[PDB]
C-alpha cells in the first residue's frame with residue numbers, strides 16, 4: 001500500500017504517509033499547554049500516524065486565535081512541550097509543530113462558545129494586528145490595527161524565536177502557518193493588504209513578509225529537519241486562475257528559499273467565497289502545485305476514507321495525506337486504514353500492548 | 361438507548377452502561393506504572409465510557425502475572441496512580457481498579473514474549489504460591505509452593521492494604537480478582553485446591569479464602585463506593601451444572617457480605633476445557649447468576665458490537681456491558697456505539713474539542 005510506505009525528507013523518516021495535520025484544541029491557558037494536550041497528542045502518536053503536527057501555536061500573545069490557543073512566545077511556554085515531544089517520539093511518530101499568528105482573525109471565541117470576535121468589554125479580548133486596517137467581516141467584524149514597520153520586524157523576530165524554541169524543545173518538523181486568512185495569508189492577499197510601502201502593492205511586496213519570515217526562520221531551524229509551510233493557494237472568490245498562478249510563483253520562491261514541503265490549502269481570507277467542499281476536493285490543486293513548483297506537498301479535507309488517501313498517493317497528487325477529523329473520531333485511524341487496505345500484520349500499526357490482541 | 365442510560369450504585373453514578381474491563385498492559389517496571397498507563401487510561405476515559413477499571417494490579421510482587429504487571433504493594437506504587445485517577449475523573453469517567461494475585465499462573469512471560477512460565481535461570485522469575493502444589497500444566501508447568509496458614513493471613517492482609525491504597529489514591533470502584541485461574545479462583549476450584557485444612561475439602565472451606573478476603577477488604581473500603589469482584593462461575597470442564605450451582609451459592613454469600621456487583625467470567629483454572637467462544641456467549645450465564653443470586657452483574661467477550669451490547673441490557677442479562685478489545689482498537693468506541701445506535705448528539709459522548717467538529 002502506498003499509504004504505508006515510509007517517507008524521508010532531509011534527515012527525518014516517517015514510518016508511513018499518514019500525517020495528522022495541526023488541529024487547535026482550545027484547551028491552553030495563557031498559551032500554556034497542559035495534560036489535555038499531552039494525552040491527546042501522545043494518544044494520536046500511538047495510533048500509528050507517521051507525522052503528528054501540533055496545532056497552531058502562537059508566536060505572540062495577540063497572535064492566538066482564541067483565549068484557549070497554545071503559545072510558544074516564552075521559554076516557559078516551550079518547556080511545556082518537552083514531555084509531549086518526548087512522548088510522541090517514544091511512540092515512533094515524528095513530532096512537528098505549526099507556528100502561527102492569527103492576524104485579523106485573532107481575539108475570537110472558541111468555536112463552541114460563539115466562534116466570533118470577542119466583545120469589546122470582555123476581559124479576555126485584545127487588539128488585533130494586520131497589514132491593513134480592514135475587517136474580515138461577518139462574525140469577525142473587528143477592525144485590526146495597521147502594522148508599523150517595527151511591528152513587522154517584531155513579528156518576524158517572534159517567528160524566529162518560536163522556531164528556535166521549537167527546535168530546542170525537540171521538534172523534528174516545523175510548519176509556518178501562512179494559510180487560512182491569518183497574518184501571513186493576509187499579507188499575500190490583495191483583499192486584505194492595501195499597503196503602499198515595501199510590504200504591499202506588487203506581487204514582490206505582498207510576498208515579502210512571507211519570504212522574509214521564511215528566511216529568518218531558516219537561520220535558526222536546522223538544515224537537516226524539514227522546514228515546511230501551510231499556504232492557501234486560492235480563495236474560490238472568482239479570481240482563482242490569477243490567484244493560483246501567483247501562489248504557484250510564491251511556492252517556487254519558497255522552494256528556492258529552502259522550503260522542503262508545502263501544505264496546500266485554501267485562503268479563507270474573506271467570507272464572500274464559494275468553496276466546493278467535497279471528499280479530497282483539494283487533490284487536483286495540490287497536484288498542480290506539486291507539478292508546477294516541483295515541491296512535495298500534502299493537503300487535507302475528506303481524506304479519512306482509506307481508499308481515497310491511497311488513490312491520492314498513487315496518482316502522485318500528494319506525498320503525505322493529512323487526516324484530521326477522522327483522528328478526533330478514532331485516535332487509531334491509522335490502524336483502521338491498515339485493516340481497510342489489507343496491509344499485512346495491520347494490528348502492528350499499533351504498539352504491542354494493543355497489537356498482540358488485535359491480530360486477526 | 362439502554363446502553364446510554366446512567367447507572368447508580370452506592371454513591372457512584374456512571375454516565376452510561378459501557379464499562380472498560382481490566383486489561384493488562386504489561387508495561388510496568390517493578391510494579392510501577394508510567395506514562396504508558398497514564399496516556400492509555402486518560403485517553404480511554406475521554407472516549408466516553410462510564411466506568412474504566414484499571415488492569416489487574418498485584419497486591420504483592422509474587423502475585424504479578426508477569427514482570428510487566430502493575431502493582432500496588434507499597435505506598436509508592438499507590439501514589440503513581442494518583443495523577444491517572446485524577447485524569448480519569450477530569451474526563452467524567454469513574455475510575456476503578458482490579459486488585460489481584462496471580463497464584464500459580466504468576467511468573468510468566470508477557471503474551472508477545474512467549475506467554476509461558478519464565479525459565480528457572482531467568483533473573484526475572486520467582487516462586488509461585490497456590491493452595492496446593494499442583495501445576496496448571498501446558499505452557500504453565502511450574503509447580504507452585506503450597507501456602508501456609510501464615511501465607512494465607514499475609515495475602516489477605518496484602519488485599520486489605522491494596523484496597524486501602526486504592527481508596528486513598530482516589531479510586532471510586534474496586535474489583536477483587538477472583539477469576540481466571542489466579543489465586544482466588546484456585547482456592548475455589550477442586551481442580552487446584554486439594555487442601556485438607558480449613559481452606560479446602562468442602563464448599564465452605566474452598567469458599568473461605570474468598571469470603572474472608574472480601575470481609576477483610578470491606579473493613580477498609582468505603583461503604584459508599586462499589587465493592588465488586590470478578591469470578592469464574594464455570595470452567596467448561598464437563599462439570600458445569602454442579603460448578604454453576606456452587607458458584608451461584610458463593611455469589612449469594614458475596615452479596616450477603618456486601619458485594620455490590622459481580623463481574624461474571626469463566627474459571628480458566630485448568631487447560632483441558634472446551635469453552636464455546638462466540639459473540640456475547642456469556643450472556644445467558646450472566647443472566648442466570650443475576651437472577652438466582654439477585655445481584656447486579658457485568659460480563660464480557662464479544663460485546664463490542666453496539667447492537668449486541670444494547671440487546672444484552674434490554675434483556676436484563678447484564679447491568680453494565682464490558683467492552684475490552686474494541687477499546688484497544690478504538691479508544692473512542694463509546695462514540696462509535698452512540699452513532700451506531702442513533703443516540704441524539706452522539707458526538708457529545710466525547711469532550712468539546714472533539715465533539716464540536718464531529719457533530720453531523
Ligand SMILES: Cc1cc2c(cc1C)N(C[C@H](O)[C@H](O)[C@H](O)COP(=O)(O)O)c1[nH]c(=O)[nH]c(=O)c1N2
Nearest residue numbers: 021022023024055056300301302303323324325717
Ligand atoms: C478541530 C480542528 C482544529 C483545526 C483544524 C481543523 C479542525 C477539525 N484545522 C484544519 C485541519 O488541519 C484540516 O485541514 C481540516 O480539518 C480538513 O481535514 P479533515 O477533513 O478533517 O481530515 C487547522 N488547520 C491549521 O492549519 N491549523 C490548525 O491549528 C487548525 N485547527
Ligand SMILES: Cc1cc2c(cc1C)N(C[C@H](O)[C@H](O)[C@H](O)COP(=O)(O)O)c1[nH]c(=O)[nH]c(=O)c1N2
Nearest residue numbers: 357381382383384415416660661662663683684685
Ligand atoms: C489485553 C488484555 C488484557 C487483559 C484482558 C484481556 C485483554 C484483551 N482480560 C480480559 C478482558 O477483561 C475481557 O474479559 C476480554 O478481553 C473479553 O472482552 P472483549 O471481547 O475483549 O470485549 C483481563 N481480565 C481481567 O480480569 N484482568 C485483566 O487485567 C485482564 N487483562
Ligand SMILES: O=c1ccc2cccc(O)c2o1
Nearest residue numbers: 023024056065111177179180
Ligand atoms: O488554521 C486553522 C485554525 C483553526 C481551525 C478550525 C477549524 C477549521 C480550520 O480550517 C481551522 O484552521
Ligand SMILES: O=c1ccc2cccc(O)c2o1
Nearest residue numbers: 383384416425471537539540
Ligand atoms: O485476568 C486476566 C489477565 C490477563 C489476561 C490476558 C488475556 C486474556 C485474559 O482473560 C486475561 O485475563
